[PDB]
């Protein structure tokens, strides 16, 4: 039975079980994963400190990115204040190294942590530990436990908390650290430092003005905040906080953000409305992976007004079959393959065989290196 | 009468003349442009050598970028060879600093050079010279006169000349160097070094296998190749060659690309078909800015097959009025403001008053800092 963390635990346990029983199809799949993971063993661990332009705090350990849809105003002599173009990512984002480096670190730690859980090979713990140590707890290279300067916007006067959604990059990694506990490489001293970091991070996201405001956001951001919250709480073994968050924040938000016909109106007004509808349901999917490990099914548990998250899947399913029928603003092509994991996750949670069949038909590539697809051999056949 | 160069010489001579006579409306506009140009006076000159990852020659003075629609194959252990996704720019392009740095050099040098031509203020020639010397002729920081590793593709076995299209980002800057000749800052020794660079670059694009191949391209790349070709030849005062290239390469190429209804079938098969149809005409437009300075109007001169560039403008015009009516694949929204300069250029060339009125109706923002709009006060209200 798997430790509590940010993954489909049913799929992980069944992979680990069939690997240990020497079943051939899984064993061959895991060996492919082991050859994918080799580059993460060699990979030099990343740090948020690897940047030149320092945040206003003058501290390189503070995470800082640019908010993606904000662009310099050509009609101003300095381009300030930046203006918003919903759905059009400003390539300046890539001048902030932590934007892609937190994504790379997250992939490395998640891949190595899962393969350690599945094979028991210490080489995977040792490498995962090296990434976790450097990114999180190192007294020089570790990030400070806050998201103060995430998605800054040049010229913007007010402080904002929307950047907190960047945290999902490293928070999955934070949760996977629990899989390497008991290894020879993850020492008790290593565990205490990360526990203390996660405690400091949970405090900040629950009590800073930015984290409070993000906890009250009325769209997919509010759902993703709670998805991240659950990973932090799950890492810290606070399963009663997970129950409280699900019932006092996630279910109310789901009850407010789903409309009577099952649409997500807050996402319907975006320039990538099919992306953001799906993005909201992805925040529910990752939350549910955690809550359902303690008996809480967020796809079928009603909000106080009777609405259930499966209604929003129902609304979107015809368009996952045919993204071209989508009749709302969508200024870039929807990636249909996002519906594979999503329909598989919601389909199984609901005993909806039509959803699971459609997930497997859409499928995932057997030899893809996309580290999020590791548990989903079930979709690669 | 302005030196031969890559700009609308009629508008530029108009601006400089009205500036010298002290006309208020033009003086206000130049004074704005000078405020915008201040950041280029301060800007540190860029060099292609400012990269860590070197090209296969191990020479930092060779330009190297990634072909923008080529992505790692996730189904491969090393991601190699990359695969193509037409229209989807791979953010990895930004890991090659000369991709954006050649654009920033281009804007700074062109802006400063045009302002020196219009105003006579030696401070603009002196700064333009600083950027030119550093990008082109400096014996340590200057770029080699070739495009051998432009738009390289990892894993691709064959050599390609598609990368040559990047040259447009610095070949306009080369062209405006002609505007600072006679200044105090641009010495006969500066001119001779640049002349020799430009000769070497011209030899490479005409005789290398990649240059030869690119000169034969049957879509917009053939047009851009010759448009870039004209900037280099005009800079070298090879007006006889400009005629030959116009008469024997551009017009046949343009005629072979236009279909009976005026559409451009090679661009219609792209995922950004309206972008690429407009991109094709933009090459013709920039080429005509140079040909029409020696009496060849590319918009109205038919090719041997009876096709004339004005047929292509005519087919695209309704969709510049209403871009949403475009009925071919277009996986990002079309930037309508591109029609402003395009319809004004072709509209004046053809004496079509309807094209010119629409150009002004779409318009450019009076205070924009986009350097390519500097000559078009006539489109700014």
DSSP per residue, A231-262: HHHHHTT-HHHHHHHIIIIIHHHHHHHS-TTS
Do residues A15 and A23 lie in contact, with contact meaning Cβ atoms separated by under 8 Å?
Answer: no
What residue in A sits closest to B36 (Cα-Cα)?
A77
Contacts 24+ apart (CB under 8 A), A230-233: A230/A6, A230/A286, A230/A287, A230/A290, A230/A291, A231/A5, A231/A6, A231/A168, A231/A171, A231/A172, A231/A174, A231/A175, A231/A286, A231/A290, A232/A171, A232/A174, A232/A175, A232/A198, A232/A201, A232/A202, A232/A205, A233/A202
Neighboring chain B residues of A368 at a CB cutoff of 8 Å: 74-75
Q: Cβ B75–A367 below 8 Å, yes or no?
A: yes
What residue in A sits closest to B95 (Cα-Cα)?
A94
Do residues A376 and A11 lie in contact, with contact meaning Cβ atoms separated by under 8 Å?
Answer: yes
Do residues A269 and A330 lie in contact, with contact meaning Cβ atoms separated by under 8 Å?
Answer: no
Do residues A298 and A287 lie in contact, with contact meaning Cβ atoms separated by under 8 Å?
Answer: yes
DSSP A149: E
What is the stated resolution of the deposited model, in angstroms? 2.4
Length of chain B: 381
Is the CB of B367 inside 8 Å of chain A's CB atoms?
yes
Is the CB of B331 inside 8 Å of chain A's CB atoms?
yes
Neighboring chain B residues of A94 at a CB cutoff of 8 Å: 91, 94
Chain B interface test: which of A66, A68, A91, A372 (most B C-beta within 10 Å):
A91
Nearest-angstrom CA–CA distance, B115 and A76: 19
DSSP B135: I
Q: Name the 3-class secondary structure at A53.
A: coil
Instruction: Work out the minimum CA distance from B72 to partner chain A, whole angstroms.
Output: 10
Beta bridge partners, B71, equal: B83
Q: Name the 3-class secondary structure at B296.
A: coil
DSSP A330: B
Closest CA to A45 of A142, A146, A131: A131
DSSP A370: -
Nearest-angstrom CA–CA distance, A99 and A68: 10
Chain A interface test: which of B367, B373, B374 (most A C-beta within 10 Å):
B367
- With residue A357 as reference, give the H or E element that holds it: helix A353-362
Closest CA to B229 of B313, B161, B286: B286
Instruction: Work out the minimum CA distance from B251 to partner chain A, whole angstroms.
Output: 35
Tokens linked to A313: 């899947």
Chain A interface test: which of B34, B91, B274 (most A C-beta within 10 Å):
B91
Q: Name the 3-class secondary structure at A70.
A: strand
Do residues A219 and A263 lie in contact, with contact meaning Cβ atoms separated by under 8 Å?
Answer: no
Do residues B20 and B119 lie in contact, with contact meaning Cβ atoms separated by under 8 Å?
Answer: no
Do residues A195 and A245 lie in contact, with contact meaning Cβ atoms separated by under 8 Å?
Answer: no
- With residue B150 as reference, give the H or E element that holds it: strand B149-152
Q: Cβ B368–A74 below 8 Å, yes or no?
A: yes
Closest CA to B235 of B187, B202, B276, B258: B202
Structure-derived torsion over alpha carbons of residues B188, B190, B196, B201, reported in degrees to the nearest 10: -140
Do residues B140 and B208 lie in contact, with contact meaning Cβ atoms separated by under 8 Å?
Answer: no
- Going from the C-alpha of A184 to that of each of A105, A133, A175, A188, A197, the distances in angstroms are 21, 15, 19, 10, 21
Neighbouring residues of B319: CB distance < 8 A, sequence distance ≥ 6: B274, B325, B326
Neighboring chain B residues of A91 at a CB cutoff of 8 Å: 91, 94, 100
How many Å is the Cα radius of gyration of chain A? 21
Nearest-angstrom CA–CA distance, B16 and B380: 17
Structure-derived torsion over alpha carbons of residues A78, A84, A86, A90, reported in degrees to the nearest 10: 30
Closest CA to B143 of B169, B161, B124: B169
Is the CB of A304 inside 8 Å of chain B's CB atoms?
no
Q: Is A168 exposed, middle or buried (0-12, 13-18, 19+ CB in 10 A)?
A: buried
Domains in chain A: ranges and CATH: 1-215 (1.50.10.100), 238-381 (1.50.10.100)
Neighboring chain B residues of A365 at a CB cutoff of 8 Å: 74-75
Q: How many CB pairs under 8 A join A and B?
A: 39
Q: Cβ A77–B35 below 8 Å, yes or no?
A: yes
Is the CB of B332 inside 8 Å of chain A's CB atoms?
yes
Nearest-angstrom CA–CA distance, A59 and A143: 10
Contacts 24+ apart (CB under 8 A), B15-18: B15/B118, B15/B375, B15/B377, B16/B117, B16/B118, B16/B119
Is the CB of A85 inside 8 Å of chain B's CB atoms?
no
Closest CA to B336 of B346, B328, B325, B327: B325
Q: Cβ A75–B333 below 8 Å, yes or no?
A: no
Is the CB of A91 inside 8 Å of chain B's CB atoms?
yes
Do residues B217 and B163 lie in contact, with contact meaning Cβ atoms separated by under 8 Å?
Answer: no
Chain A interface test: which of B40, B332, B363 (most A C-beta within 10 Å):
B332
b/e per residue B172-190 (b: at least 16 CB within 10 A): bbbbbbbbbeebebbeeeb
Neighboring chain B residues of A369 at a CB cutoff of 8 Å: 74-77, 79
Give Cα A197 to chain centroid, integer Å: 19
Do residues A220 and A283 lie in contact, with contact meaning Cβ atoms separated by under 8 Å?
Answer: yes
Instruction: Work out the minimum CA distance from B369 to partner chain A, whole angstroms.
Output: 5
């Amino acid at each position: 039975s798997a430790p509590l963390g940010p993954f489909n635990a049913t799929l992980l346990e069944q992979l680990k079980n069939d690997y240990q029983k020497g079943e051939k199809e899984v064993t061959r799949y895991i060996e492919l994963q082991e050859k994918v993971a080799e580059k993460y063993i060699k990979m030099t661990p990343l740090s948020v400190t690897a940047k030149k332009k320092l945040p206003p705090s003058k501290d390189p350990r503070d995470y800082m990115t640019l908010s993606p849809y904000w662009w310099p105003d050509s009609t101003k002599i300095d381009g300030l204040p930046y203006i918003r173009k919903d759905g059009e990512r400003n390539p300046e984002v890539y001048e902030y190294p932590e934007r892609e480096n937190a994504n790379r670190f997250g992939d490395a730690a998640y891949c190595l942590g899962v393969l350690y859980y599945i094979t028991g090979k210490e080489v995977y713990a040792k490498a995962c530990a090296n990434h976790l140590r450097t990114w999180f707890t190192d007294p020089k290279l570790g990030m400070n436990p806050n998201m103060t300067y995430a998605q800054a916007v040049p010229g913007m006067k007010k402080m904002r908390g929307s950047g907190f959604i960047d945290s999902r990059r490293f928070s999955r990694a934070l949760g996977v650290a629990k899989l390497i506990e008991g290894s020879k490489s993850w020492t008790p001293s290593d565990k205490k430092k990360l526990d203390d970091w996660a405690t400091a991070f949970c405090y900040w996201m629950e009590n800073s003005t930015q984290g409070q405001r993000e906890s009250h956001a009325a769209n997919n951001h509010g759902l993703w905040y709670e998805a991240i919250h659950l990973m932090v709480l799950a890492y810290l073994d606070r399963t009663d906080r997970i129950r409280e968050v699900a019932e006092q924040s996630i279910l109310p938000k789901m009850g407010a953000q789903i409309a009577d016909d099952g649409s997500l109106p807050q996402e319907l007004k975006r320039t990538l409305s099919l992306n953001y509808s799906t993005f909201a349901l992805e925040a529910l999917m990752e939350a549910n992976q955690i809550t359902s490990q303690i008996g809480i099914n967020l796809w079928s548990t009603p909000a106080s007004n009777g609405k259930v998250a499966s209604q929003a899947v129902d609304y979107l399913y015809p368009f996952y079959l045919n993204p071209e029928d989508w009749k709302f603003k969508q200024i870039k092509p929807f990636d249909q393959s996002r519906a594979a994991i999503l329909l598989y996750e919601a389909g199984t949670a609901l005993g909806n065989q039509k959803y699971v069949d459609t997930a497997k038909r859409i499928g995932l590539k057997y030899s893809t290196s996309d580290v999020e697809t590791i548990p989903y051999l079930v979709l690669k056949k």
